[PDB]
Amino acid sequence: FNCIDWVHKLTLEITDFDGSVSTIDLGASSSRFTNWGSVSLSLDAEGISGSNSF
Amino acid sequence: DPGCSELIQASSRITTCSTEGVNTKCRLSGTALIRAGSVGAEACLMLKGVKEDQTKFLKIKTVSSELSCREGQSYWTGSFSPKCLSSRRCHLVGECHVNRCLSWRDNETSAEFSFVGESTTMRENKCFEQCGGWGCGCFNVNPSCLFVHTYLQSVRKEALRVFNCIDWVHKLTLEITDFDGSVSTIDLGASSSRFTNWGSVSLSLDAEGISGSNSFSFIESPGKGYAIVDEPFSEIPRQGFLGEIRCNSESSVLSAHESCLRAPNLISYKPMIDQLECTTNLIDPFVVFERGSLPQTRNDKTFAASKGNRGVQAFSKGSVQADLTLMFDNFEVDFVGAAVSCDAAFLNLTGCYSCNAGARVCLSITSTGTGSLSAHNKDGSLHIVLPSENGTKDQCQILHFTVPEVEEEFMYSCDGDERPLLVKGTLIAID
Amino acid sequence: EDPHLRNRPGKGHNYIDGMTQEDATCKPVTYAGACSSFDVLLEKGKFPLFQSYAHHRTLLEAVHDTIIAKADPPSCDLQSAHGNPCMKEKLVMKTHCPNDYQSAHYLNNDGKMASVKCPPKYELTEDCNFCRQMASLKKGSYPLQDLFCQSSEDDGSKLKTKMKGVCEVGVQALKKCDGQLSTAHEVVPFAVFKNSKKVYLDKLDLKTEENLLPDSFVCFEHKGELKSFDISQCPKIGGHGSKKCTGDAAFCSAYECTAQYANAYCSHANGSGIVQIQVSGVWKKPLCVGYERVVVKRELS
């Protein structure tokens, strides 16, 4: 396979208020689904250009 | 304290009157031109009946100089998060087939998720190929299918209507006072036309006009402030730019209706036998909304929201040079011929001469009832008209002069009889 | 929300003095009986106003509700000579009306219900000016204009007709036109307040505020096929009534409901509530808003 763009993914281990541990991940502007609602990465200023030729 | 400044007399070409029950009912039908005032100054067209005391007033107060924006192409955007629903089924059972799951249509509803319903919520149907045999969860050697029923849900509790501007319309908010006493507030922008009960008003001459707004898009928020974006407006709902998942109304965004537009094939998928991680990559409008929240100055102006009416405006630091056009649609103006009398007194005089701001005057009008005062000099340079009331009241209006040493005797009349009145005061040079 | 356009709240009377020959099948108005003064209002695709305001009163029911006065005489005789007061007010109403009729009610200048009459044996013509000889004859009254009625006690006697660009409409002498005028036939709506005048409407601005009102619910029956019954017999919260009635959250949220023990099913209506008007830039609550097709004399150079 190939890669059209390098998505800056950040593996976050969100801990709830009661103490529930949930490990998720957020990249660029992707959203997930947690027990407390939803979360998504906002600002992103990190990337690698030239990925189609690999 | 600020009152009428540009005081002109109506021509007799469109002025008529008819006595009905000892009541001169003046009627106007035509088009008149009046000079617009500056910030604080007012303008009114004085009516002349069949005698001296019969004189009304149509004073119009100018609030401030506003620069409204012209809207056009807009859309309702918002954030959304997909909800993937995976259900792996072995081959030769139900609808799990090797030649059907690959070329699966989007409009067709799968049997593994047909219990949801054919609602207006944004949905889509996919079809992935998995493995077969006892290595994952089947009985035949043929690969199994993966029925996917992903539906979109609204994330943000509010929607935004991103619009754009093509030209800055110089709008002047006016508070027109009718002849009977009904006060109405309207607005005139560049060449706008607003119909009233006594006719219609329109703006003719314009001055301020910011050119260069086609490469800037605005963001409107219901109930809160506005915003500004430093990029040209986008119309094609593509990926990357603002407006990937748009709609046409607030209910279509808060409830995710099928009438909204979106880019084909935009929801990613991660098939993991029985697991599924569907997600999107849409730009959050609240990021630019927070990074560019008004007030945001540009070049040499100040962009802000409006007060009362919804719409983007702009503030400038220039003068007020415009001409108001009045129109009368046969509006009957009655006035009793038995007017009351009253006496006036001088108070103070502070302002400027030979300027658009003029100079305010203080006059103590003491009468016995609600009437109208009319004052005129000798050389025919100025004219004072103040609505008389009952008791000792403080009145006055804007009086422009051409000499800092103001010294001219005025003769005021409330019901026909004239009385002398000398005024004085110093002024400053205001250009 | 079953469409029931036969239940009439309040009195439900449709008759005028001098011609009370329809008090058997129209007093009150129910499912049984045949009255030409109510059956013509249920036409399909003809009277959208009465279909929209189904659970509201009309004009005759408003007169019989002791909330508005009637004209004098209430039934002008079109057969007598030496003229009649009901001539200059109806002659300007150039409208179409079927034959086999004997009466026609409308609104005059003083805000009163002015109607005509036809003694036996005379029937109305195509215009309704004179009465001619005559098949069954509809002894009721054909409504020449479409309007509704409701309960309102808001003050507004000093508010007259406020029109712009029209010097004379219908028969009333509004503003004085010193120049010329053009005679045309247009449809101009009108309105009426509590003891006022026939206030015509230039900008029709109406709204419906649907609220928990007793006239916004229809009760059914329990057999063991759901026919209507009555709404004034259902018990209330803290009050007393006849047979117990139940329903959904709207009927049980305001009244008393026992579901299984109840013997009636009260459901919510459709298109009924507080209706206000926007005249002179202010919101008011009138008695009935309607329209007509009369002679409109606008301004002309």
DSSP conformation letters of B28-41: EEEEEEEE---SS-
E strands within B70-144?
A: 75-77, 80-83, 86-89, 123-129
d(CA C109, CA C93): 13
Q: Is A28 on the interface with B (CB under 8 A)?
A: yes
d(CA B398, CA B359): 5
Tell the residue number behind the tokens 């309607």, with chain if given.
C290
d(CA B199, CA B32): 12
| CB burial of residue A43 (10 Å; 0-12, 13-18, 19+) | exposed
Tell the residue number behind the tokens 């039908």, with chain if given.
B29
Residue B421: its H or E element: strand B418-426
Q: Is A15 on the interface with B (CB under 8 A)?
A: no
Q: Which chain C residue shows the shortest CA-CA distance from B25? A: C176
**Under a CB-based contact definition with an 8 Å cutoff, are residues B109 and B82 in contact?**
no
What is the identity of the amino acid at C213?
L
Tell the residue number behind the tokens 């096929």, with chain if given.
C225
Residues of C in contact with B194 (CB under 8 A): none
Q: Which chain B residue shows the shortest CA-CA distance from A29? A: B281
Chain-chain contact of C176 with B16 (C-beta, under 8 angstroms): no
Torsions phi, psi of B171, nearest 5?
A: -95, 135
Which among B81, B283, B287 is the nearest to A31, CB-wise? Answer: B81
Task: For residue C172, give the nearest of C88, C70, C292 by alpha carbon.
Answer: C88
**Under a CB-based contact definition with an 8 Å cutoff, are residues C190 and C171 in contact?**
no
| Mutate which: B79, B81, B286, vs A, most A CBs within 10 A | B81
Which among B18, B197, B329 is the nearest to C178, CB-wise? Answer: B18
Supply C63's token pair: 């007169």
Torsions phi, psi of A19, nearest 5?
A: 130, 10
Residue C26 Cα, gap to closest chain B Cα (Å): 45
Number of neighbours of residue B258 by Cβ within 10 angstroms: 13
Torsions phi, psi of B389, nearest 5?
A: -130, -175
d(CA B106, CA B343): 86
| CB burial of residue B338 (10 Å; 0-12, 13-18, 19+) | exposed
What is the identity of the amino acid at C287?
L
CA torsion angle for B186, B192, B195, B198 (degrees, to 10)? 80
d(CA B28, CA B13): 9
Residue B359 Cα, gap to closest chain A Cα (Å): 56
d(CA C58, CA C202): 22
Size of interface B-C (CB pairs under 8 A): 15
d(CA B318, CA B302): 13
Task: For residue B358, give the nearest of B415, B317, B320 by alpha carbon.
Answer: B320
Chains in contact with A, where contact requires at least 3 CB pairs less than 8 Å apart? B
Angle at B90 between CA B89 and CA B95, to 5 degrees: 65
d(CA C58, CA C67): 12
Chain-chain contact of A30 with B281 (C-beta, under 8 angstroms): yes
Q: For residue C30, what are the β-bridge partners?
A: none
E strands within B290-358?
A: 296-298, 301-305, 312-315, 323-336, 342-353
The residues in B 55-84 lying below 8 A from A, measured between CB atoms, are 79, 81, 83
Q: Is A51 on the interface with B (CB under 8 A)?
A: no
Residues of B in contact with C179 (CB under 8 A): 29
Residue B287: its H or E element: helix B285-291
Strand B405-413 with B371-376, pairing: antiparallel
Q: Is B48 on the interface with C (CB under 8 A)?
A: no
Task: For residue B173, give the nearest of B28, B368, B39, B273 by alpha carbon.
Answer: B39
Please name the residues in contact with B240: beta carbons below 8 A apart, sequence gap of 6 or more: B283
Task: For residue B326, give the nearest of B198, B206, B208 by alpha carbon.
Answer: B198
d(CA B247, CA B259): 7
Number of neighbours of residue B361 by Cβ within 10 angstroms: 23
Buried-exposed string B48-68: b where 16+ CB fall within 10 A, e elsewhere: bbeeebbbbbbbbbbeebbbb
Which among C164, C165, C178 is the nearest to B27, CB-wise? Answer: C178
Per DSSP, chain A holds a count of helices (H) and strands (E) of 0, 2
Tell the residue number behind the tokens 């229809």, with chain if given.
C218
**Under a CB-based contact definition with an 8 Å cutoff, are residues C106 and C94 in contact?**
no
d(CA C187, CA B50): 39
d(CA B63, CA C71): 51
The alpha carbon of C174 is separated from its chain's Cα centroid by a whole number of angstroms, namely: 25
Which among A29, A42, A43 is the nearest to B282, CB-wise? Answer: A29
Buried-exposed string C7-37: b where 16+ CB fall within 10 A, e elsewhere: bbbbbbbbbbeebeebeebbbebeeeeebbb
d(CA B125, CA B146): 11
Measure CA of the first residue to CA of the last residue in chain B; give whole Å. 21
| Mutate which: A5, A31, A41, vs B, most B CBs within 10 A | A31
Number of neighbours of residue C301 by Cβ within 10 angstroms: 7
Chains A and C touch (3+ CB pairs under 8 A): no
Q: Which long-range contacts (CB under 8 A, 24 or more apart) does B94-100 make?
A: B95/B145, B95/B147, B96/B144, B96/B145, B96/B147, B97/B145, B98/B129, B98/B142, B98/B143, B98/B145, B100/B127, B100/B145
The residues in C 261-300 lying below 8 A from B, measured between CB atoms, are 299
Please name the residues in contact with B28: beta carbons below 8 A apart, sequence gap of 6 or more: B10, B14, B15, B16, B47, B328, B330, B331, B333
**Under a CB-based contact definition with an 8 Å cutoff, are residues B164 and B226 in contact?**
no
Residue B431 Cα, gap to closest chain C Cα (Å): 42
